[PDB]
Design a protein around this nucleic acid. Sequence first.
RNA 1: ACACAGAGACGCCCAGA
RNA 2: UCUGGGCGGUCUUUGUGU
Length: 1715
Amino acid sequence: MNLEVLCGRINVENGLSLGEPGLYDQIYDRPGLPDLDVTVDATGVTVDIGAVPDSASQLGSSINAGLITIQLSEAYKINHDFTFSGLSKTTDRRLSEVFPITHDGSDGMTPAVIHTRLDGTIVVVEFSTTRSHNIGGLEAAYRTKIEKYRDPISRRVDIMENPRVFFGVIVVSSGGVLSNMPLTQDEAEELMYRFCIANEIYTKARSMDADIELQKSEEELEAISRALSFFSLFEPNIERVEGTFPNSEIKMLEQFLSTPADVDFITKTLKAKEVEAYADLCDSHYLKPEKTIQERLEINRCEAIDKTQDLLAGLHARSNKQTSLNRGTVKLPPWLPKPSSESISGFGSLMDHGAYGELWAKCLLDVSLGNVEGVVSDPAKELDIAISDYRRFKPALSSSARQEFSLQGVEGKKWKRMAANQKKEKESHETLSPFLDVEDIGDFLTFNNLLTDSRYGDESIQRAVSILLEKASAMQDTELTHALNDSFKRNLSSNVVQWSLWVSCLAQELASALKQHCRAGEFIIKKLKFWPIYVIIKPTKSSSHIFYSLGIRKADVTRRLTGRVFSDTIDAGEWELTEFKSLKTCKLTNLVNLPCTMLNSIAFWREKLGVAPWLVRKPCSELREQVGLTFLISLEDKSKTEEIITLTRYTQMEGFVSPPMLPKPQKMLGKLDGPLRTKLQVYLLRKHLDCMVRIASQPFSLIPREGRVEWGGTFHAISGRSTNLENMVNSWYIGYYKNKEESTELNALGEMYKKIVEMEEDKPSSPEFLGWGDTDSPKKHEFSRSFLRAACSSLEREIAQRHGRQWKQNLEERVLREIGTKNILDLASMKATSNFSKDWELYSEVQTKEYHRSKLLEKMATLIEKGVMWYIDAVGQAWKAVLDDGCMRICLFKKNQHGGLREIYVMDANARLVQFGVETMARCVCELSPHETVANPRLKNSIIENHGLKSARSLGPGSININSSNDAKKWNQGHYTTKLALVLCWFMPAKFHRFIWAAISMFRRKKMMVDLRFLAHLSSKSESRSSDPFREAMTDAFHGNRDVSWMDKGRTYIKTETGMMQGILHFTSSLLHSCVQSFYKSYFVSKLKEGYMGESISGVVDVIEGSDDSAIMISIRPKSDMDEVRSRFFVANLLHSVKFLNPLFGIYSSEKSTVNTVYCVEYNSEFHFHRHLVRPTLRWIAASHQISETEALASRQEDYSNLLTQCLEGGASFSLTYLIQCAQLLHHYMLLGLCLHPLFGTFMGMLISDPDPALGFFLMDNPAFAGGAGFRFNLWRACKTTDLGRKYAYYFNEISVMVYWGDRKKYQALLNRMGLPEDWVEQIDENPGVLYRRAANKKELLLKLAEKVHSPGVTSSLSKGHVVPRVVAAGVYLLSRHCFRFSQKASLIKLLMMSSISAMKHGGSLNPNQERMLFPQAQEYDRVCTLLEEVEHLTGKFVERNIVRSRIDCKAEDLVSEVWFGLKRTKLGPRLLKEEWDKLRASFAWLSTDPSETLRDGPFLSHVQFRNFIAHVDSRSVRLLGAPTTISQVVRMNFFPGFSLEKSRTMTLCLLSNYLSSRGGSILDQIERAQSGTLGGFSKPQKTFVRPGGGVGYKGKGVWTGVMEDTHVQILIDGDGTSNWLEEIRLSSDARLYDVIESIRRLCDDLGINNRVASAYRGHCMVRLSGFKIKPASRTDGCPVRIMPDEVKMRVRGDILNLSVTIQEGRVMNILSYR
RNA sequence: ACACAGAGACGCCCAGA
RNA sequence: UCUGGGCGGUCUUUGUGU
Ligand SMILES: O=c1ccn([C@@H]2O[C@H](COP(=O)(O)NP(=O)(O)OP(=O)(O)O)[C@@H](O)[C@H]2O)c(=O)[nH]1
Ligand SMILES: [Mg+2]
């Protein structure tokens, strides 16, 4: 309506004013809604408006009741345009036209109505519209708009004299209209009615997928616009880029894009590599001349024997050549005493039994003469501290004793220069000969007494564990849990676990003593709390060695562990003593975790051999061998020890190689080099050599049975005993029992510097093979441009075929959106960033200063403080800094892995911002690839599974499948970082090239810090005498005696030009490997088409690729016996030619690859053996004890639950899950101070009073469904069935026990460097909308940063390695010194008494309101709890080798945000919105539309707690392994292997029974929640005028929108009065196209639909669908298959079962009715 | 004792003889 | 080379992705 009257009524007097916000609610009565007929075209959406329904209150003058139309591009403002079009005047002007330019960057955006004709003013009446149901969101919108538009106007005020400006804001919502210019109630009513009718139009229009998936709002368009503006105005100064980085000319990119691939070179090179591969495969694999398989195997065995003997001779020639040595693998005594109690006759016989005897006697004399206090803590003294709220001796050791101790490292620094110490040091470096006699290790492994019963079931430690386990099982006390508990007791009464108990106690007590220091000659003596073993301890410091000597009376040792693998013990008169041994912080974790490790090992290797936990059987040879091997690996904890058994997987996968090809296990002799320093290493190496000889002698026998393919003849990697396939795969994985987190000494940092340099120094001198020309015999780091063009074109063809034509525009828009939506804060994280700069280059200046890495969060917050809020506004500054620097800065360390040796690089702050854009670009490009899995996880378990279906469909029954599991070597340093730029720039638009090329061109000069301490100890070592050229290379490179290109005179860095870094260009290299795999796929299809005699071989080829590990799968069908051999030969040639085709692409095939394997593939350690999927369970079983350093006590339990779930999903039965949860309980209580605190039993007794998990109680899963339910499920069960619910209800009615680690010394400092305000809580409270959205301004980003830094995740992120020793070192004072915090400092005994004195003031239970508030998922918890009583006793039968994968399965966050702030986040319409909000109000009565009303009248003081509450309100799904009512089936099948415990038609019958019985609520919602589909209806009801039509109406238009099989089915329908036909069809999920088509046709024929009329649309399309049949997407005719609430009458028909779902016309549609 | 085809660690900072 | 004392979320130490 009129604007001049609205403008002229205001009068400006002095200057700029904001006005007064007037709020006008609904005052006058409102009519209904006019009749609206909306139709969506291919170019616009148009509305016909009917008569206004009886405007008795003069409301509706603005509407015209005629015809209106809008565009698709203008549709997203369908409210903001149509509501406000009466006041809209076409101006297209900015204030910059009427005000002089102040150069503030505000000269381009039109700010809505800016009517100027009032005495020379500008008003800028700027407009808005919201869906808020309250005032708080309206106030937030007003504040956001005024903050957006206030500052530039005030900046532009002062340019002219006497300003007259008067800015204003209008906001319209359903609840009312708030403004600031003078407005009367009538036009406010008009605007609100226009808003209601426009919202109705928008609701009708939201049944169109062109608008549902349209751009959300102006935020996405503005992000795309700013990204476009940055990308079109970014000058990287390319001449400088060429001047400072090598190989940075644009001409490489121009010639790659312009000059096509030379077909003649490709044709010549392919036949050259084909004949080379044929010659190599004949020569190496013995085909010329012709021979049988047997003699081929014998001569391959001869080659293997010769190669192993050559390696043995080479290792023996560099050793000390000794065939006998007395060395113990386990350096701990074999004592297994009987612990009784605290027990602190010729004490002179120890003096003359050596130096250790002298020390022990002169210590025990001080013990007897001195004070008992100090050795152990008195219970009374510790109890006197909690309620009321170390022994050191200096013996005069002799010179001989001091020298003997210094020989073993005790005070060895002072006696370094003596002759004996120097001789010991010289002999220490000697390598052991491989021919050393190690028969004792094999004798111990084969025969031992580790699993024999120890008979201490009535022991106090076992009594404590038993009572705690009985209390944990008291709430579930049935027969099955009792049987498995008794089995755990038997596993706790073995000899090995009883030895491990006192060993773990010693390790934990050493970890406690690691923080103590002693003077020269002082020692610390203690007694084990249970066992009568005395420990003498020499502490140096925490980061150095701890020394210990053990002593025990000869009468207290009841029995010993058999075997000669133990170190010699000194035999004195009445005591047995052990020499001084050393440990470190890293080595203690394995010894702490020892009894749990043995318990889990016994459980796993007991069930894997087929004996039940509840059966009694004597241990066999192989079980003892596996347990002893695990014991020795855990006790030794050395990298070279586990490397040999790690390589056994790659060695033993070669036994699956099919003819014609021989097994090649002797290719791994290259990685088996290196010195051997222990007897166990020698034994493992010889067993590995024997395994290679046995593998080369005979392959694994692949037997085709009646319905499945099986493998026989498989055997253990080390012990060599014949076992099953699963046992072999698991035995490949015993080497991960070593700790990941191994502290690396400085002397090992040099050798890991080799891999950076040893491949850099061989850079080719000519860069004309680095991307310029073509080469048929390429050196490493070189590649062919033509081959890269061919592979890139092949992947381009694949992407265009899969995602339709003009896909580059979609890729451009998604890349622009992804870049624009990124802010500064998302890249801020608690990951380490480098601090290396130009000031750190010269060692002559940084010799004293020590280098510390900073946090990325701190630097990103520093950039936030400087007024940088968007990501694109920092990349330019980062590139300016990097280009001025001239190089990219990197700092290194070592990865704490198991698979080998690996260096890890860390960027500075500048390079990360540049790398992030390229990373997102490459990820978005790889998302289009149909065989890339790094960005598409769903393809990991899809391509392998669907290959069988494709082979069955295309080739039919009887298909031979041949696989190749390729792995690349040196994936990072091999790729010269010009290939990746070319590959990325092939797929990207033309205007994005000049940033992609630059950002990747900075990887060609890498500037890497080396360790400063390494430089300090190398500077004073200018003379080197090592038998390795790299050591002297480092020495004279640092000292400048020679010239190298990778280190200069006195520089703290190394230069690296060739190669990328690890994972830094992960997605781009994934794209490159996808291109290579696509080229190989096309080439393989071509060769299978051209045949071998000219007759084609009918076969299917598909490839999968990740980062460097790929797999090629080829299924072929021979037609005869003679054809099969030739076809297998041809396929073997094709799969072998990749090893020579890869160097043309610069990829080097490793010896880790297993080529030409039938019915077997490995991709990501996921071994697919035909229809039997194999996972290594031992990795997750060994992963069940590393926990994160957390502050709350229950968080330890939830971490244990997470690790337990990880162990369950790896393929473990529920019995192992229960047993390893028992071991987790034991581990948690030992960390609580079970073996280090005198006051545990009383603590134990106090847990009689209260089983509170927050106070230190461990909850246990139900043994039938253990691991699959979280910790919160156990908490819920305990609250319902025990008295814990009373305590929780009392605590809630009154208104958790958490401990600070280091009292937040670092955290607070991390706060103080940021400078964040301490008053941010009220700023969050006053604008509730700062969350639930992303960001809009600098202040809200700062507030979100302050919210991020005050989070549990960032709190539990400053923890360092060796978490278990640091946790257990606090176990001596966790109970009896004030360390916990309650919701000041108080000991946990005090917390238990405070809980106990309030236990008398307890009553009732948890009402439904509190348990719904606290325990949000209670419904499915009860549903899964009520499905467990059907099987409760050990009743069943023994009847598994068919293990496959199985899976077991609006929300309030969107609802609250939409209601309170009007942000579109829900699919549901207004009716369902009101219904869901009413249900949420029924859930919590304190909720209200006003945010302030909910804040003030709620239990949360500020909005952040409310936000975390809503986040915690909002599904748990678990993946298992087993054979192919579902819950009952998987529980019955997955309890124990081979043992049973006592479209889907069945689901359709269940739904029908529910419909006839009406057990639940709406049957439509029950069907939808059951994942069945077929729910929806019309939105244009096919307008019906008169009967003469074909069904009265059925003419003109019509759309059916609904959900079937989780899709957005939006079938367009149209009739001409004589027939009805579909027009366009849209689908969301393309999982099962054929079943969806069948269901669609079945729905269609019930109403009557013809597909004769094809279409009128020839645009973008993925599949074109003719009549009831799939056709090619663009051939002819068809229709464009496109990928992007009331129940009144369910009557039935006759003679057929029917469900009347008649939506808007007299025809019945069927859901699942049928006959 | 740990690390290593001999680079390290086996204590480190403080005023006093 | 001795004398007194002080020393822990110490440092080493943890990157790119899923
Ligand atoms: O922790 C990791 C592990 C793997 N990766 C990335 O994944 C790649 C493959 O991981 P990889 O174990 O195969 N190492 P690679 O350099 O290929 O040599 P090799 O072990 O002999 O085959 C590596 O080259 C890294 O780029 C990481 O970035 N971080
Ligand atoms: Mg690899």
